[PDB]
Design an enzyme around this catalytic site. Structure first.
Site, short mmCIF file in Angstrom:
data_model
loop_
_atom_site.label_atom_id
_atom_site.label_comp_id
_atom_site.label_asym_id
_atom_site.label_seq_id
_atom_site.Cartn_x
_atom_site.Cartn_y
_atom_site.Cartn_z
N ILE A 2 -0.86 8.11 -12.14
CA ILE A 2 -1.20 7.06 -11.17
C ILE A 2 -2.33 7.49 -10.23
O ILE A 2 -2.85 6.66 -9.48
CB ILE A 2 0.03 6.64 -10.35
CG1 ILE A 2 0.56 7.82 -9.51
CG2 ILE A 2 1.12 6.08 -11.25
CD1 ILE A 2 1.52 7.41 -8.40
N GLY A 3 -2.71 8.77 -10.25
CA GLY A 3 -3.78 9.20 -9.36
C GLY A 3 -4.55 10.38 -9.92
O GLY A 3 -3.99 11.25 -10.59
N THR A 54 -9.26 17.58 -8.68
CA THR A 54 -8.71 18.39 -9.78
C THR A 54 -7.19 18.50 -9.68
O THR A 54 -6.61 19.59 -9.72
CB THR A 54 -9.34 19.77 -9.82
OG1 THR A 54 -8.77 20.58 -8.79
CG2 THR A 54 -10.85 19.68 -9.61
N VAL A 73 -1.70 12.87 -9.99
CA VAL A 73 -0.42 12.44 -9.43
C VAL A 73 0.23 11.49 -10.42
O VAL A 73 -0.39 10.50 -10.84
CB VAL A 73 -0.59 11.78 -8.05
CG1 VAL A 73 0.76 11.35 -7.51
CG2 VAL A 73 -1.28 12.74 -7.10
N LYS A 116 2.62 15.66 -7.84
CA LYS A 116 1.22 16.06 -7.77
C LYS A 116 1.07 17.41 -8.47
O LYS A 116 1.68 18.39 -8.05
CB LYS A 116 0.73 16.14 -6.33
CG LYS A 116 -0.71 16.61 -6.23
CD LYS A 116 -1.34 16.29 -4.88
CE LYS A 116 -0.88 17.23 -3.79
NZ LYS A 116 -1.86 17.25 -2.66
N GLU A 124 8.65 12.11 -2.41
CA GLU A 124 9.07 10.72 -2.38
C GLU A 124 7.99 9.83 -3.00
O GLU A 124 6.79 10.06 -2.81
CB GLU A 124 9.33 10.32 -0.93
CG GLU A 124 9.66 8.86 -0.69
CD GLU A 124 9.75 8.55 0.79
OE1 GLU A 124 9.31 9.39 1.60
OE2 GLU A 124 10.27 7.47 1.14
N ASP A 138 -7.33 14.57 7.46
CA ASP A 138 -7.84 13.68 6.43
C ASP A 138 -7.25 12.28 6.62
O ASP A 138 -6.90 11.60 5.65
CB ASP A 138 -7.54 14.19 5.03
CG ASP A 138 -8.48 13.61 3.98
OD1 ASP A 138 -9.49 12.98 4.35
OD2 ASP A 138 -8.21 13.80 2.77
N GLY A 172 -3.18 17.57 1.86
CA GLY A 172 -3.90 18.62 1.15
C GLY A 172 -5.01 19.28 1.94
O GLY A 172 -5.55 20.30 1.48
#
Ligand SMILES: NC(=O)c1cn(-c2ccnc(N)n2)c2cc(C#CC3(O)CCCCC3)ccc12
Length: 291
Positions: free
Chosen positions: A29-30, A34, A37, A52, A98, A142, A162
Protein backbone atom coordinates in the site's frame (compact mmCIF):
# COMPACT_ATOMS: atom_id res chain seq x y z
CA UNK A 1 31.20 -4.20 8.05
CA UNK A 2 29.07 -1.35 9.35
CA UNK A 3 26.04 -3.24 7.99
CA UNK A 4 26.44 -6.24 10.29
CA UNK A 5 27.25 -3.93 13.20
CA UNK A 6 23.91 -2.22 12.60
CA UNK A 7 22.10 -5.55 12.35
CA UNK A 8 23.56 -6.65 15.69
CA UNK A 9 22.64 -3.32 17.28
CA UNK A 10 19.05 -3.69 16.04
CA UNK A 11 18.86 -7.18 17.55
CA UNK A 12 19.14 -5.53 21.00
CA UNK A 13 15.98 -3.40 20.59
CA UNK A 14 13.99 -5.43 18.03
CA UNK A 15 11.46 -8.08 19.03
CA UNK A 16 12.82 -11.64 18.70
CA UNK A 17 11.68 -14.21 16.17
CA UNK A 18 10.32 -14.14 12.66
CA UNK A 19 7.14 -12.10 12.09
CA UNK A 20 6.35 -14.14 8.94
CA UNK A 21 5.25 -16.81 11.45
CA UNK A 22 2.09 -14.94 12.49
CA UNK A 23 1.60 -12.51 9.55
CA UNK A 24 0.38 -13.28 6.03
CA UNK A 25 -1.56 -11.82 3.07
CA UNK A 26 0.79 -8.93 2.41
CA UNK A 27 -0.88 -6.18 0.37
CA UNK A 28 1.51 -3.43 -0.71
CA UNK A 29 0.00 0.00 0.00
CA UNK A 30 3.00 2.33 0.22
CA UNK A 31 6.45 2.99 -1.20
CA UNK A 32 9.00 5.77 -0.85
CA UNK A 33 12.27 6.02 1.07
CA UNK A 34 13.43 2.49 0.10
CA UNK A 35 10.78 0.94 2.32
CA UNK A 36 7.43 -0.62 1.45
CA UNK A 37 4.35 -0.52 3.65
CA UNK A 38 1.99 -3.49 3.41
CA UNK A 39 -1.23 -4.61 5.07
CA UNK A 40 -1.02 -7.96 6.84
CA UNK A 41 -3.28 -10.28 8.82
CA UNK A 42 -2.48 -11.67 12.27
CA UNK A 43 -2.90 -15.46 12.22
CA UNK A 44 -3.72 -15.52 15.93
CA UNK A 45 -6.62 -13.04 15.85
CA UNK A 46 -7.33 -12.22 12.20
CA UNK A 47 -6.83 -8.52 12.95
CA UNK A 48 -5.16 -6.28 10.38
CA UNK A 49 -1.87 -4.44 10.86
CA UNK A 50 0.50 -2.36 8.77
CA UNK A 51 4.05 -3.60 8.24
CA UNK A 52 6.74 -1.15 7.17
CA UNK A 53 9.71 -3.06 5.73
CA UNK A 54 12.90 -1.04 5.18
CA UNK A 55 16.00 -2.51 3.56
CA UNK A 56 18.98 -1.51 5.70
CA UNK A 57 21.43 -1.42 2.77
CA UNK A 58 19.37 1.32 1.09
CA UNK A 59 19.15 4.07 3.72
CA UNK A 60 20.58 7.58 3.68
CA UNK A 61 20.35 7.76 7.50
CA UNK A 62 20.01 4.37 9.20
CA UNK A 63 20.14 5.97 12.67
CA UNK A 64 16.64 7.40 12.19
CA UNK A 65 15.31 3.84 11.96
CA UNK A 66 16.84 3.39 15.42
CA UNK A 67 14.92 6.47 16.59
CA UNK A 68 11.63 5.23 15.16
CA UNK A 69 11.83 1.80 16.78
CA UNK A 70 13.20 3.06 20.11
CA UNK A 71 11.31 6.31 20.70
CA UNK A 72 7.96 4.95 19.53
CA UNK A 73 7.95 1.52 21.16
CA UNK A 74 5.65 1.41 24.19
CA UNK A 75 4.37 4.85 23.15
CA UNK A 76 0.59 5.10 23.56
CA UNK A 77 -1.55 8.08 22.56
CA UNK A 78 -4.98 8.20 20.93
CA UNK A 79 -3.68 10.61 18.25
CA UNK A 80 -0.46 8.71 17.45
CA UNK A 81 -0.16 5.57 15.34
CA UNK A 82 0.75 2.84 17.80
CA UNK A 83 3.64 0.50 17.06
CA UNK A 84 3.12 -3.03 18.34
CA UNK A 85 6.37 -4.79 17.40
CA UNK A 86 9.54 -4.56 15.34
CA UNK A 87 11.59 -7.35 13.78
CA UNK A 88 14.80 -7.97 11.84
CA UNK A 89 14.03 -10.16 8.81
CA UNK A 90 17.34 -10.73 7.08
CA UNK A 91 18.56 -7.32 5.90
CA UNK A 92 15.10 -5.77 6.36
CA UNK A 93 13.76 -3.97 9.43
CA UNK A 94 10.04 -4.61 9.93
CA UNK A 95 7.83 -2.35 12.03
CA UNK A 96 4.39 -3.76 12.85
CA UNK A 97 1.85 -1.06 13.65
CA UNK A 98 -1.82 -0.18 13.88
CA UNK A 99 -3.52 -0.10 10.47
CA UNK A 100 -5.41 3.13 9.69
CA UNK A 101 -8.09 2.19 7.16
CA UNK A 102 -9.12 5.77 6.34
CA UNK A 103 -5.94 6.58 4.42
CA UNK A 104 -3.75 9.65 4.54
CA UNK A 105 -4.82 13.29 4.74
CA UNK A 106 -3.09 14.14 1.44
CA UNK A 107 -5.76 12.16 -0.40
CA UNK A 108 -8.37 14.49 1.10
CA UNK A 109 -6.53 17.77 0.56
CA UNK A 110 -5.91 16.98 -3.12
CA UNK A 111 -9.47 15.89 -3.97
CA UNK A 112 -11.82 17.92 -1.74
CA UNK A 113 -12.21 21.19 0.14
CA UNK A 114 -12.11 21.05 3.93
CA UNK A 115 -14.13 23.39 6.14
CA UNK A 116 -12.87 25.12 9.26
CA UNK A 117 -14.64 22.64 11.55
CA UNK A 118 -12.74 19.76 9.95
CA UNK A 119 -9.48 21.72 9.75
CA UNK A 120 -9.84 22.54 13.45
CA UNK A 121 -10.53 18.89 14.29
CA UNK A 122 -7.36 17.84 12.46
CA UNK A 123 -5.32 20.60 14.12
CA UNK A 124 -6.69 19.80 17.58
CA UNK A 125 -5.74 16.14 17.15
CA UNK A 126 -2.26 17.00 15.89
CA UNK A 127 -1.69 19.53 18.68
CA UNK A 128 -2.90 17.11 21.35
CA UNK A 129 -0.35 14.60 20.06
CA UNK A 130 2.36 17.26 19.77
CA UNK A 131 1.96 18.72 23.26
CA UNK A 132 2.68 15.32 24.82
CA UNK A 133 5.40 14.44 22.29
CA UNK A 134 7.22 17.74 22.85
CA UNK A 135 6.76 17.46 26.61
CA UNK A 136 8.80 14.27 26.25
CA UNK A 137 11.36 16.00 24.04
CA UNK A 138 10.27 14.16 20.88
CA UNK A 139 10.35 16.15 17.63
CA UNK A 140 8.47 14.60 14.71
CA UNK A 141 10.38 16.73 12.14
CA UNK A 142 8.14 15.68 9.25
CA UNK A 143 4.70 17.16 9.95
CA UNK A 144 2.76 17.20 6.66
CA UNK A 145 -0.50 15.88 5.23
CA UNK A 146 1.18 12.57 4.33
CA UNK A 147 1.94 12.04 8.04
CA UNK A 148 -1.75 12.26 9.03
CA UNK A 149 -3.73 9.01 8.90
CA UNK A 150 -7.43 8.55 9.58
CA UNK A 151 -9.79 5.86 10.78
CA UNK A 152 -12.96 4.85 8.97
CA UNK A 153 -14.95 6.91 11.50
CA UNK A 154 -12.84 10.06 11.19
CA UNK A 155 -10.33 9.78 14.03
CA UNK A 156 -7.02 11.50 13.28
CA UNK A 157 -3.62 10.02 14.16
CA UNK A 158 -0.07 11.25 13.60
CA UNK A 159 2.23 8.89 11.73
CA UNK A 160 5.57 8.47 9.94
CA UNK A 161 8.11 9.10 12.69
CA UNK A 162 10.96 8.03 10.39
CA UNK A 163 12.62 11.44 10.82
CA UNK A 164 11.90 11.94 14.52
CA UNK A 165 14.49 12.69 17.19
CA UNK A 166 14.68 13.24 20.93
CA UNK A 167 16.01 16.13 23.00
CA UNK A 168 16.63 16.40 26.75
CA UNK A 169 17.67 18.95 29.35
CA UNK A 170 21.27 17.98 28.58
CA UNK A 171 20.83 17.98 24.78
CA UNK A 172 17.95 20.39 24.06
CA UNK A 173 18.40 21.01 20.31
CA UNK A 174 19.15 19.23 17.03
CA UNK A 175 21.14 20.42 14.03
CA UNK A 176 20.43 17.83 11.34
CA UNK A 177 18.75 18.76 8.06
CA UNK A 178 15.74 16.42 7.90
CA UNK A 179 12.16 16.78 6.66
CA UNK A 180 10.38 17.46 3.39
CA UNK A 181 11.67 20.71 1.81
CA UNK A 182 8.43 22.71 1.45
CA UNK A 183 7.38 22.06 5.08
CA UNK A 184 10.74 22.83 6.70
CA UNK A 185 11.08 25.60 9.27
CA UNK A 186 13.26 28.66 8.58
CA UNK A 187 15.72 27.97 11.41
CA UNK A 188 16.02 24.33 10.30
CA UNK A 189 16.97 25.05 6.68
CA UNK A 190 19.26 27.82 7.97
CA UNK A 191 21.41 25.15 9.68
CA UNK A 192 20.51 26.54 13.10
CA UNK A 193 20.09 24.52 16.30
CA UNK A 194 16.36 23.93 16.60
CA UNK A 195 13.92 22.40 19.03
CA UNK A 196 10.30 21.22 18.92
CA UNK A 197 9.21 24.58 17.46
CA UNK A 198 9.95 23.29 13.95
CA UNK A 199 6.95 20.97 14.35
CA UNK A 200 4.71 24.01 14.89
CA UNK A 201 5.91 25.75 11.72
CA UNK A 202 5.42 22.56 9.70
CA UNK A 203 1.93 22.23 11.17
CA UNK A 204 1.26 25.74 9.91
CA UNK A 205 2.35 24.70 6.43
CA UNK A 206 -0.08 21.78 6.63
CA UNK A 207 -2.83 24.27 7.48
CA UNK A 208 -1.98 26.07 4.25
CA UNK A 209 -2.12 22.63 2.65
CA UNK A 210 -5.63 22.17 4.04
CA UNK A 211 -6.67 25.62 2.82
CA UNK A 212 -4.93 25.94 -0.57
CA UNK A 213 -4.44 22.24 -1.38
CA UNK A 214 -0.65 22.61 -1.59
CA UNK A 215 2.22 24.09 0.42
CA UNK A 216 3.90 27.39 -0.47
CA UNK A 217 6.34 27.36 -3.40
CA UNK A 218 5.13 23.91 -4.48
CA UNK A 219 5.90 24.88 -8.08
CA UNK A 220 9.53 25.70 -7.28
CA UNK A 221 12.35 23.15 -7.02
CA UNK A 222 13.14 21.86 -3.51
CA UNK A 223 16.37 23.81 -2.98
CA UNK A 224 14.97 27.01 -4.52
CA UNK A 225 11.87 26.84 -2.32
CA UNK A 226 14.07 26.16 0.71
CA UNK A 227 16.15 29.27 -0.03
CA UNK A 228 12.90 31.24 -0.37
CA UNK A 229 11.70 29.99 3.02
CA UNK A 230 15.12 30.89 4.45
CA UNK A 231 15.06 34.47 3.13
CA UNK A 232 11.46 35.60 2.60
CA UNK A 233 8.82 36.50 5.19
CA UNK A 234 6.34 33.89 6.47
CA UNK A 235 4.24 32.77 3.49
CA UNK A 236 0.69 34.04 3.06
CA UNK A 237 -2.39 32.02 2.16
CA UNK A 238 -3.45 31.98 -1.47
CA UNK A 239 -7.13 31.39 -0.63
CA UNK A 240 -7.02 34.09 2.04
CA UNK A 241 -10.68 34.94 1.36
CA UNK A 242 -11.83 31.49 2.54
CA UNK A 243 -10.35 31.63 6.06
CA UNK A 244 -12.10 33.22 9.05
CA UNK A 245 -10.33 35.72 11.32
CA UNK A 246 -10.01 33.01 13.97
CA UNK A 247 -8.13 30.74 11.55
CA UNK A 248 -5.83 33.57 10.41
CA UNK A 249 -5.05 34.47 14.02
CA UNK A 250 -4.30 30.82 14.76
CA UNK A 251 -2.08 30.40 11.69
CA UNK A 252 -0.11 33.57 12.46
CA UNK A 253 0.96 32.05 15.80
CA UNK A 254 2.37 29.08 13.83
CA UNK A 255 4.27 30.67 10.92
CA UNK A 256 6.67 32.85 12.91
CA UNK A 257 10.25 33.12 11.62
CA UNK A 258 11.78 33.64 15.06
CA UNK A 259 11.28 30.32 16.92
CA UNK A 260 11.32 32.14 20.26
CA UNK A 261 8.05 33.90 19.40
CA UNK A 262 6.56 30.86 17.65
CA UNK A 263 3.77 29.40 19.77
CA UNK A 264 4.11 25.99 21.42
CA UNK A 265 1.63 23.12 21.18
CA UNK A 266 0.54 23.52 24.81
CA UNK A 267 -0.20 27.20 24.19
CA UNK A 268 -2.02 26.51 20.92
CA UNK A 269 -4.33 24.04 22.66
CA UNK A 270 -5.93 27.08 24.33
CA UNK A 271 -6.69 28.93 21.10
CA UNK A 272 -10.33 29.82 20.29
CA UNK A 273 -10.06 28.50 16.72
CA UNK A 274 -9.89 24.95 18.07
CA UNK A 275 -13.36 25.50 19.54
CA UNK A 276 -14.63 25.15 15.95
CA UNK A 277 -13.28 21.59 15.97
CA UNK A 278 -15.90 18.96 15.23
CA UNK A 279 -16.15 15.30 16.19
CA UNK A 280 -14.70 12.53 13.99
CA UNK A 281 -18.11 12.20 12.33
CA UNK A 282 -17.41 15.60 10.75
CA UNK A 283 -14.32 14.10 9.10
CA UNK A 284 -16.26 11.02 7.89
CA UNK A 285 -17.68 12.82 4.79
CA UNK A 286 -14.23 14.10 3.77
CA UNK A 287 -13.13 10.47 3.30
CA UNK A 288 -12.61 9.00 -0.16
CA UNK A 289 -14.70 5.92 0.74
CA UNK A 290 -17.70 8.21 0.11
CA UNK A 291 -18.08 11.65 -1.55
N1 LIG B 1 4.46 4.85 2.91
C1 LIG B 1 3.05 4.79 3.21
O1 LIG B 1 2.25 4.93 2.34
C2 LIG B 1 2.58 4.53 4.63
C3 LIG B 1 1.34 4.04 5.03
N2 LIG B 1 1.31 3.93 6.35
C4 LIG B 1 0.24 3.49 7.01
C5 LIG B 1 0.33 2.85 8.24
C6 LIG B 1 -0.84 2.42 8.86
N3 LIG B 1 -2.00 2.62 8.26
C7 LIG B 1 -2.05 3.23 7.08
N4 LIG B 1 -3.34 3.44 6.45
N5 LIG B 1 -0.95 3.65 6.47
C8 LIG B 1 2.51 4.35 6.85
C9 LIG B 1 3.00 4.45 8.18
C10 LIG B 1 4.29 4.91 8.44
C11 LIG B 1 4.75 4.98 9.89
C12 LIG B 1 5.08 5.03 11.03
C13 LIG B 1 5.49 5.07 12.49
O2 LIG B 1 6.57 5.96 12.65
C14 LIG B 1 4.30 5.57 13.31
C15 LIG B 1 4.57 5.51 14.82
C16 LIG B 1 5.01 4.12 15.26
C17 LIG B 1 6.19 3.59 14.44
C18 LIG B 1 5.93 3.67 12.93
C19 LIG B 1 5.12 5.29 7.39
C20 LIG B 1 4.65 5.20 6.08
C21 LIG B 1 3.33 4.73 5.82
Amino acid sequence: SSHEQFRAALQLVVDPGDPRSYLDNFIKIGEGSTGIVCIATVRSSGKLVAVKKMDLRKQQRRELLFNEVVIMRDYQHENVVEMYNSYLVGDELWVVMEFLEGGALTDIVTHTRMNEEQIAAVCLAVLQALSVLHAQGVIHRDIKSDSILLTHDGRVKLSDFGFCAQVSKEVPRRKSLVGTPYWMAPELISRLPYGPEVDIWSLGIMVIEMVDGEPPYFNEPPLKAMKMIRDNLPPRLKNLHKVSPSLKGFLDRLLVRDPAQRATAAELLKHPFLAKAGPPASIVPLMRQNR
